[PDB]
Amino acid sequence: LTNLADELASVAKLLLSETALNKHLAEAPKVRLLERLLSDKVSAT
Amino acid sequence: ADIEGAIEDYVSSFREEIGTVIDAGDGIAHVEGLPSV
């Protein structure tokens, strides 16, 4: 749980850093983009 | 800057372009999508 929370906080700050990805993502391919971007940078959960 | 390529591949992942009406009134309609119109 602690690792998941830290990873999610890092993800949130990253997403804040670049708003372009959020803009282009708010509107199945989304998942594939996620793995191609940070599949291993974050845990499975 | 590798993420740029990933997002480009994502957008390219989506054949004839089809837009969606997002608002309409008084004889005007706004359509999201149709990047090549």
From Swiss-Prot, chain A:
UniProt-annotated location(s): Cell membrane
Other remarks in the entry: Binds 2-aminothiazole antibiotics, which are antitubercular agents.
Function: F(1)F(0) ATP synthase produces ATP from ADP in the presence of a proton or sodium gradient. F-type ATPases consist of two structural domains, F(1) containing the extramembraneous catalytic core and F(0) containing the membrane proton channel, linked together by a central stalk and a peripheral stalk. During catalysis, ATP synthesis in the catalytic domain of F(1) is coupled via a rotary mechanism of the central stalk subunits to proton translocation.
Family: In the N-terminal section; belongs to the ATPase B chain family. In the C-terminal section; belongs to the ATPase delta chain family.
The protein's assembly and partners: F-type ATPases have 2 components, F(1) - the catalytic core - and F(0) - the membrane proton channel. F(1) has five subunits: alpha(3), beta(3), gamma(1), delta(1), epsilon(1). F(0) has three main subunits: a(1), b(2) and c(10-14). The alpha and beta chains form an alternating ring which encloses part of the gamma chain. F(1) is attached to F(0) by a central stalk formed by the gamma and epsilon chains, while a peripheral stalk is formed by the delta and b chains.
Identification of the protein by name: ATP synthase subunit b-delta
Gene transcribed to yield this protein: atpFH
From Swiss-Prot, chain B:
Covalent S-S links between cysteines: none
Taxonomic superkingdom: Bacteria
Cellular localisation: Cell membrane
Family: Belongs to the ATPase alpha/beta chains family.
General function of this protein: Produces ATP from ADP in the presence of a proton gradient across the membrane. The alpha chain is a regulatory subunit.
Oligomeric and partner information: F-type ATPases have 2 components, CF(1) - the catalytic core - and CF(0) - the membrane proton channel. CF(1) has five subunits: alpha(3), beta(3), gamma(1), delta(1), epsilon(1). CF(0) has three main subunits: a(1), b(2) and c(9-12). The alpha and beta chains form an alternating ring which encloses part of the gamma chain. CF(1) is attached to CF(0) by a central stalk formed by the gamma and epsilon chains, while a peripheral stalk is formed by the delta and b chains.
Name of the protein this chain belongs to: ATP synthase subunit alpha
Record lineage: Bacteria, Bacillati, Actinomycetota, Actinomycetes, Mycobacteriales
